[PDB]
Amino acid sequence: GFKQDIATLRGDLRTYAQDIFLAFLNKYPDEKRNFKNYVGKSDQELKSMAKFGDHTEKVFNLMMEVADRATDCVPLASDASTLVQMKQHSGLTTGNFEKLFVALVEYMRASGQSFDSQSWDRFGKNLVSALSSAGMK
Numbered sequence: 117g118f119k120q121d122i123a124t125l126r127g128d129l130r131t132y133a134q135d136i137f138l139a140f141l142n143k144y145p146d147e148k149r150n151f152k153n154y155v156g157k158s159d160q161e162l163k164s165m166a167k168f169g170d171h172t173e174k175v176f177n178l179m180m181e182v183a184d185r186a187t188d189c190v191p192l193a194s195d196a197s198t199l200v201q202m203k204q205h206s207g208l209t210t211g212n213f214e215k216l217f218v219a220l221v222e223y224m225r226a227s228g229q230s231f232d233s234q235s236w237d238r239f240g241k242n243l244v245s246a247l248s249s250a251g252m253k
């Protein structure tokens with residue numbers, strides 16, 4: 117289920133993080149408006165860029181911590197507020213996060229592994245709701 121998935125993702129996190137974020141960028145190309153330095157690059161070229169690998173894994177490091185601290189796929193209010201207040205997120209809206217989690221859920225469903233895709237869909241929706249409650253437009 118959800119908790120086992122966190123362990124599975126953590127056991128190969130740099131690869132999962134990059135592959136999921138690439139799925140997001142490729143499914144939603146306009147989202148590169150927030151990633152100007154990732155424009156004009158193929159998947160393999162992005163994977164060679166130091167900040168791409170390091171930032172994506174750090175993003176997913178924390179996403180797993182937020183998932184791990186959640187109850188029934190509902191994140192803590194303190195984690196949601198952290199995500200709203202981060203300066204790195206100053207320009208973002210809940211739709212940016214919804215699209216990330218649509219891509220994450222589709223990635224899991226296209227994989228051959230028994231990911232609990234339904235719980236990750238709940239987690240993404242519940243995260244969006246917590247982000248809105250904590251002030252994100």
Ligand code: MNR
Pocket residue numbers: 147150151170171174175176178179180182204205208212213214216243
């Ligand atoms: C589509 C937009 C974005 C979505 C969705 C998103 C969703 C999430 C998310 C999901 C639950 C988590 C956990 C998360 C966490 C982070 N995030 Mn976030 N994020 N996020 C950015 C846009 C987005 N984030 C940007 C832009 C930056 C800073 C620039 C960069 O590192 O390229 C950043 C930065 C970061 C960093 C700092 C990385 C460092 O400096 O190396 C963490 C940690």
Ligand SMILES: Oc1ccc(Br)cc1
Pocket residue numbers: 137167168171172175216
């Ligand atoms: O550098 C970044 C990579 C992926 C996300 Br999601 C946010 C920032």
